[PDB]
Amino acid sequence: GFTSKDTYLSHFNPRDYLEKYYKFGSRHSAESQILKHLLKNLFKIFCLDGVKGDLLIDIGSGPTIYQLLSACESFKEIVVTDYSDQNLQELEKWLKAAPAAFDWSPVVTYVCDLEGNRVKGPEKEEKLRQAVKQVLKCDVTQSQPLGAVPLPPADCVLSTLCLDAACPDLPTYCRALRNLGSLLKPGGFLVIMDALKSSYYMIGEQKFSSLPLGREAVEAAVKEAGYTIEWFEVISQSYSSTMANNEGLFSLVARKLS
Ligand SMILES: Nc1ncnc2c1ncn2[C@@H]1O[C@H](CSCC[C@H](N)C(=O)O)[C@@H](O)[C@H]1O
Numbered sequence: 001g002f003t004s005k006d007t008y009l010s011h012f013n014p015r016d017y018l019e020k021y022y023k024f025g026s027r028h029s030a031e032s033q034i035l036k037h038l039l040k041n042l043f044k045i046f047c048l049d050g051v052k053g054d055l056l057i058d059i060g061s062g063p064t065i066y067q068l069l070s071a072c073e074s075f076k077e078i079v080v081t082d083y084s085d086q087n088l089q090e091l092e093k094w095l096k097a098a099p100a101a102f103d104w105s106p107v108v109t110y111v112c113d114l115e116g117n118r119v120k121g122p123e124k125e126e127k128l129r130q131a132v133k134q135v136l137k138c139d140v141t142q143s144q145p146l147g148a149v150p151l152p153p154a155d156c157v158l159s160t161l162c163l164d165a166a167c168p169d170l171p172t173y174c175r176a177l178r179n180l181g182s183l184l185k186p187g188g189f190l191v192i193m194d195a196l197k198s199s200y201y202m203i204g205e206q207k208f209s210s211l212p213l214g215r216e217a218v219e220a221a222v223k224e225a226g227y228t229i230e231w232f233e234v235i236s237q238s239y240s241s242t243m244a245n246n247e248g249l250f251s252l253v254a255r256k257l258s
């Protein structure tokens with residue numbers, strides 16, 4: 001009763017996802033209100049709080065880079081990961097500054113604004129491109145998410161809008177949190193942002209299953225998985241009716257218990 005893993009390889013259109021959720025158009029859409037809030041939290045986590053280190057692993061990056069714009073100010077290296085090779089190719093297109101890459105300029109500008117206008121768009125983009133060295137395949141459902149590929153234990157593991165889409169049930173969800181912890185150094189940071197109580201999301205006519213969790217189930221799973229929560233925020237803002245049936249989104253910062 002849940003989207004098969006292999007559907008992500010074939011039917012998740014990276015460009016269409018970017019057009020539908022991250023175009024950041026002139027009209028005050030629900031998608032843009034969500035994106036602005038996620039950016040505020042990411043700015044607060046990486047620039048205001050002490051979330052820093054040599055390595056940050058982004059889990060289930062999809063074709064997006066918005067979740068890394070503040071992070072590149074605090075981590076020497078950022079490793080981007082996704083189950084879809086098609087998604088990693090779209091990421092790589094932006095990373096190499098190709099002309100057919102997605103235009104992130106209204107999002108890049110917004111981040112520079114948030115950060116105190118210390119830098120401009122081109123300088124911001126360059127710091128991120130220099131931070132990303134590895135573009136890897138990952139599967140959160142596996143005990144070794146990065147498979148046979150080795151990495152030093154991360155200082156931080158970030159995952160935006162991935163676990164609800166990747167986990168068919170609550171046992172898999174708690175298991176995936178434990179699997180992300182195996183990529184984390186003891187006492188390392190876990191940053192998760194996702195939808196609340198969503199049973200699906202859409203990319204045009206293409207439907208994708210989502211695990212509908214309430215904030216209590218998310219908190220319980222993080223505790224069961226061996227983390228300690230530092231903060232937890234719920235926003236009431238949901239996606240447009242045509243996109244998903246969520247009841248807001250959550251953001252949390254936790255630490256791996258040694
Ligand atoms: N088992 C799995 N392991 C890892 N990534 C998975 C996965 N199942 C789905 N995904 C990925 O999870 C993503 C959900 S969309 C979220 C994309 C991006 N992080 C953002 O914030 O918009 C897709 O890129 C999909 O390919």
Ligand SMILES: NC1=NCCc2ccccc21
Pocket residue numbers: 021161162164165195198200201210239243244246
């Ligand atoms: N992974 C997602 N990407 C787009 C928005 C969304 C809404 C609800 C559940 C999942 C998602």
